[PDB]
Paper text:
C6 (form 2), C10, [name], and C13WT have also crystallized in space group P21 but with a distinct unit cell, two molecules in the ASU, and a unique conformation of the donor substrate (we term here form 2 - see also below). Interestingly, the others diverge from this canonical binding, we term here form 2: in C6 (form 2), C10, and [name] (crystallized isomorphously in space group P21 with two molecules in the ASU) the substrate sequence is kinked ~ 90° at the P3 residues and tracks instead between the dynamic Met49 and Gln189 regions. This altered substrate trajectory appears to be coincident with the close contact of the donor C-terminal domain in this crystal packing. P4 residues in all substrates except C5, which interacts with Gln189 Oε1 form a hydrogen bond between main chain NH and Thr190 O. In the non-classical (form 2) poses we observe here, the P3 side chains (Thr (C7, C13), Met (C10) or Arg ([name])) instead extend toward the S4 pocket due to rotation of the P3 main chain, perhaps another reason for the restricted sequence diversity at P3. In the form 2 peptides, P5 and P6 are redirected between Met49 and Gln189, possibly due to the dramatic shift of the Gln189 side chain, reminiscent of motions observed in the C5 structure to accommodate the unique P2 phenylalanine. We note this critical hydrogen bond is also conserved in all of our kinked (form 2) substrate structures as well as canonical poses, highlighting its importance in substrate binding.
The [name] of [name]-[name]-2 ([name], also referred to as 3-chymotrypsin-like protease or 3CLpro) is responsible for the majority of nsp processing, cleaving at 11 conserved sites along the polyprotein including self-excision of [name] by autolytic cleavage of its own N-terminal and C-terminal autoprocessing sites. [name]-[name]-2 [name] is a functional homodimer of two symmetrically disposed protomers that are each 306 residues in length (33.8 kDa). The active site of [name] features a Cys145-His41 catalytic dyad, which orchestrates nucleophilic attack at the carbonyl carbon of the invariant P1 glutamine and the formation of an acyl enzyme intermediate central to efficient peptide cleavage. Using C-terminally substituted [name] chimeras, we have determined X-ray crystallographic structures of [name] in complex with 10 of its 11 viral cleavage sites, bound at full occupancy intermolecularly in trans, within the active site of either the native enzyme and/or a catalytic mutant ([name]).
Author numbering:
A (entry chain A), B (entry chain B): 1 to 306
Write the structure that this text describes.
Amino acid sequence: SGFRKMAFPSGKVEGCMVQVTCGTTTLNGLWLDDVVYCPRHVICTSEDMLNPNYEDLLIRKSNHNFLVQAGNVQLRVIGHSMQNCVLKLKVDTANPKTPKYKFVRIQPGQTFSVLACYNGSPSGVYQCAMRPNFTIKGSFLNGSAGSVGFNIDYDCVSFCYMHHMELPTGVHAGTDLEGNFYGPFVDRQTAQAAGTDTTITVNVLAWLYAAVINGDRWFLNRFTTTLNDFNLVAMKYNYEPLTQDHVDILGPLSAQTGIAVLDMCASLKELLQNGMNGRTILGSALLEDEFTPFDVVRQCTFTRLQ
Amino acid sequence: SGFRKMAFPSGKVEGCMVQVTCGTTTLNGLWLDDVVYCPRHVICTSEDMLNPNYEDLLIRKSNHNFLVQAGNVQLRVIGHSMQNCVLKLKVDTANPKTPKYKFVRIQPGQTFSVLACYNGSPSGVYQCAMRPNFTIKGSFLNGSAGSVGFNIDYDCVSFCYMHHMELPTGVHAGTDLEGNFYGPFVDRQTAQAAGTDTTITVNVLAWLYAAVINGDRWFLNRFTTTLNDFNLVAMKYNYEPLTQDHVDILGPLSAQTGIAVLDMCASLKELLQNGMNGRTILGSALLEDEFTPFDVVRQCTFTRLQ
């Protein structure tokens, strides 16, 4: 037993990570087959004019301006194109380690594994959830842009995030693998702020279900409530509304634990009104909302079926 | 910026994982060159009286009895022997994916990355700290035994832990790669309890530094204290006593923060008594003690040396 934030194994992703340098600017690229994808602001430099326009600056760059290295080997750029906020760098060598993959746009509330990288070299791995305000609470320094996030589904690496920038609040923003930002953000030197965030109600219920599976059940009561009355409570604590779709996604954890979803909502309603009473749940003094129902099941299993 | 529990990329380790099956028991193995390392209780059968004779089961078993799988490929065991609580299965093929590696005995307070496995097949990765009572707080199900914990140092993998079992309190126990258990535990079906766990004082300090580097400062104070003076307020509070060895270790964090360790100790003493008064530090409502100083440094940029 035991429950912990757990990243997907990063081996498949590590073999696609490369360093991209244009001028004195370096960041990370993702090498699949004969293409390297990377944030377009690799072409930005110090001596650029204020609030540059990427159209104009890329026009100055030739193939020979982009220096891509996969370890101690130079990949030769043979073509470049810009697709929204990412650069597609056609190279003359196919990555022999390209996994089965898909490009995916995750929804808010969902999690993914982040392979933070520097200078083309993977550095560490951890879980993030896409916040309802379309930011993630990551750990990224300068040189980490191009790091990707991803999930594994059977044999297929689903890439869902490429990191670009940090916001003044200290939270992070990036694109899908087509260069489309999550949230109202731009890879520009313009003032931006994350909007107000909300708590991912469905995730907190999954976490409480995980808590029960692991024997942490002090917060259960005989009580139950309705979907309407729970949501009237949730709204007042900045929790996002709970939909029947959410209730159904919690099915397997309710089947597994024997605790009906609306039973769980009553315990949660109670922790929201009266607090955690100095108690910790799974070693946390706060309510965790970055564990999806899938992430719990992934870690406990369904033992009804023998 | 930002601060997160971060596992090492697990790629170099995933290529070492294999599946070991003796009779009806299946757990994971570690395939380094031409040796597979695994827990000895893979040979245990519940049909045993219980108190096992591991040595004579080695005589009882032949090489045929051990089924080693790298994916769907079988490795013929050509030798088998016991070293403390670990099996060393000699196979006919040397692991072509063997990395540069050491075998190390971690010290209580140090951290490592656990690659959680079932059936030779990686499931996920997360950080653990070896607790002062020689347990770890992981997420391990039945069949997770044989999973390893490791640290990457350049391109050399330091294997420091192999998981064997779970204690009735929900924490986990294991050996180094030489089969020697961390702590007074044995791999038998007998009543065992972990001693009293204590907070790793040096690590809470390192964490408080990570917050200051990252922006969380409210806890700081112009107040000061001394070493024995701080260790008074702490020993009664179940904390590891702080030593001059720990002070020095935090040197670089103080150097970057310009905050003296004793000054940090003072505001930490203040944090023990008062409590956090509904306030968080780096997204946490309790003091985190599983970030070592070096773990912090790896997630910070250091203005000093330019």
